[PDB]
Amino acid sequence: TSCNPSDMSHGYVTVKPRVRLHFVELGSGPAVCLCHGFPESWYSWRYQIPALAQAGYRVLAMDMKGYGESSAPPEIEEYCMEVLCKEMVTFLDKLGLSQAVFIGHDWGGMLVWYMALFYPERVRAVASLNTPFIPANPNMSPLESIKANPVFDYQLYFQEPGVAEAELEQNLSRTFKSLFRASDESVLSMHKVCEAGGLFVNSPEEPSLSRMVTEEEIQFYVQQFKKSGFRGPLNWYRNMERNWKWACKSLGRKILIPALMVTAEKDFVLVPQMSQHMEDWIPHLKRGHIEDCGHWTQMDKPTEVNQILIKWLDSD
Amino acid sequence: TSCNPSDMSHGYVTVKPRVRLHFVELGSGPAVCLCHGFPESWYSWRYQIPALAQAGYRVLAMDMKGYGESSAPPEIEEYCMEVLCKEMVTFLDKLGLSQAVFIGHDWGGMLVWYMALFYPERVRAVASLNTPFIPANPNMSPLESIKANPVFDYQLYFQEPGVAEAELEQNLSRTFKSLFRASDESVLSMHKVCEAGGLFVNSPEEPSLSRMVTEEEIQFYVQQFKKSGFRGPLNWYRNMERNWKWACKSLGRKILIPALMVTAEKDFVLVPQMSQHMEDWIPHLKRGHIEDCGHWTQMDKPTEVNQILIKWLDSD
Ligand SMILES: CCCCC/C=C/C=C1/C(=O)C=C[C@@H]1C/C=C/CCCC(=O)O
Ligand SMILES: CCCCC/C=C/C=C1/C(=O)C=C[C@@H]1C/C=C/CCCC(=O)O
């Protein structure tokens, strides 16, 4: 069902002087590049990697920039979509891949949509878990839309360098145990986070283990976030204006490659209806939907995700 | 094109607890595994890697065990063909590859033949540069046949641990410059070695650069061999009796998969006539022959090698 880390092939590509990307590689056939969200790991794909490899695909599961064994420079702007996307292009180039299928989740989903938008020639097909494609509005700056949405208040808590880092870094076991839970097991404070104290303030000093994860799984994440901590990961969130500026340069060009949007019923931040008018911009869009599935889609509902991904990969 | 190392994707697979194999990877398509000889590197395939990738192949060029970034344990028996082949099967297993084409040269070529003989289900097709397949004789150990050939005297000089190590390691740049030359430029001393005072008696202290290589190329080999020296590499030559016993367990089976033997006119050790009658063991054997080509085949005639390999890959 899953991956044992020391049993994988581990690859490293230098995409620029400062920066190498690590990834794990399994399988033969068309290249499928898996891109995780915040605050995750290649390992978040642990149930998909063997499944897609067995279905006849060559899987490359990334540590995204800021995570795991990939470099984690401290500057905020090293994590804007524009920089991350160019770097993913160089990654392909150095591997001698002219294209790959890109599949992302959360921030990885965002990334893959912008890859499809700006580098369609390098993207065979694109799929997102939970993250919709929303075209930028040149009259709506990002900070206004985020204030309108109360469940997005945690993104404001993430802006100030050092603040979310100190809470997240305080106790890594507690961090991951409090984050990685089914929606019904969650006690995260998302709505008035700065004023509440932080994300974890109404959550135990020793949380129980979610039914989704084992202690061993939790400890792999703990160990992975020792090397660089949370700064780079959090920087993904600190480029809103820059990313908005870059997206407005699309100037309504349309994604024409095959595309798959998978929504999760119980993701309370990336809610299904935020995807609702994607076919106005991607008319051939295909969809999948997973009941009883929270934010941590690949872990919560691995069987359903695998089924949806393999069916789509095999047809489009 | 050749290859620039820091522009490559580097892969690492742990084949057993304290043994990991390094490789470089380029291209999409059917997996082709390149296996170098003594005393070389993945970098000996520098001209084939991009040619083969451009031709539609996914190239994995290994550091073989003992070399470069791969593990180099000191024990002689870690480098017998039986141990080396089972590790390559495990390599494929961990990469999720049910098969690959195996292309070897010199000791790598010996390895690919044992892979094709003993693990044909994992070898889609096999190609060797210079190294013939020789059926083992269950009576005469090759001991006497090795003694019979004067140009294999260097192999006897390689037997005693530490002796050839000291000569080869004394001045790495002189080693590689003395080794890596077209056959017409060689001044290697191969017949009387144990007695006559080492491989390099006739070599200038500062040899000129063969027309086949640049200084920067030579220096890459120097840097590689600083990590683990010559003991692992030399251990490849120190398992003749074990290899002969393993090969006798083949009980005269044939190699039934697609196979290519490439001879080199001016290799004076792996002479072309040594491949005569290979088709009696290998029904689907194709052939290639390179004129004016010495032992360092990939480097001496890279254009002819590329053409020969690609044509055979595309047909068989
Ligand atoms: C900083 C961590 C980013 C992870 C984003 C959390 C996402 C999603 C969740 C759910 O979809 C369900 C629980 C978490 C947080 C949302 C909580 C809403 C209040 C809990 C409830 O009453 O259901
Ligand atoms: C032991 C280190 C590996 C060296 C294997 C050398 C292989 C092959 C050669 C040739 O095919 C041609 C030159 C080298 C060594 C053979 C030399 C014979 C004497 C040179 C001469 O003709 O005067």
Side-chain angles (χ1 to χ4, degrees), chain A residues 107-158:
Chain A
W107 269 112
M110 197 72 78
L111 179 290
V112 306
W113 286 125
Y114 280 92
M115 288 291 295
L117 217 211
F118 285 109
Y119 304 90
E121 77 282 353
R122 309 309 289 278
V123 179
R124 180 65 185 85
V126 60
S128 183
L129 305 190
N130 309 46
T131 309
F133 172 70
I134 307 299
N137 167 29
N139 326 298
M140 165 206 75
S141 93
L143 225 127
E144 296 152 76
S145 33
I146 280 145
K147 287 235 145 184
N149 201 147
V151 84
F152 282 37
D153 186 67
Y154 81 91
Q155 303 190 188
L156 304 186
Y157 177 62
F158 292 177

Side-chain angles (χ1 to χ4, degrees), chain B residues 38-39 151 154 158 179 183 186 188 190-191 199 237 266-269 294-296:
Chain B
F38 177 89
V151 90
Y154 82 91
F158 291 175
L179 288 177
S183 66
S186 185
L188 289 173
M190 300 289 267
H191 290 229
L199 267 22
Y237 281 97
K266 308 302 188 89
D267 186 339
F268 300 145
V269 28
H295 185 67
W296 314 105

Side-chain angles (χ1 to χ4, degrees), chain A residues 154-178:
Chain A
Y154 81 91
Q155 303 190 188
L156 304 186
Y157 177 62
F158 292 177
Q159 298 306 300
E160 187 73 55
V163 178
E165 287 84 333
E167 196 186 5
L168 296 162
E169 294 185 30
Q170 201 268 311
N171 179 347
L172 294 177
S173 187
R174 180 166 187 243
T175 284
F176 296 103
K177 286 175 187 214
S178 300

Side-chain angles (χ1 to χ4, degrees), chain A residues 6-14 23 25-29 53 58 91 93-98, chain B residues 6-14 23 25-29 31 53 58 93-98:
Chain A
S6 72
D7 283 350
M8 309 305 290
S9 184
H10 294 266
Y12 307 80
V13 171
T14 297
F23 64 103
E25 196 172 31
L26 188 74
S28 61
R58 178 187 172 177
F91 177 79
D93 284 345
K94 299 246 179 143
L95 278 151
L97 302 170
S98 48
Chain B
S6 33
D7 293 338
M8 311 305 283
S9 182
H10 297 259
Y12 305 82
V13 175
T14 292
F23 64 103
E25 190 171 44
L26 186 80
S28 52
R58 170 189 180 181
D93 284 340
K94 295 198 174 168
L95 278 152
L97 305 173
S98 43

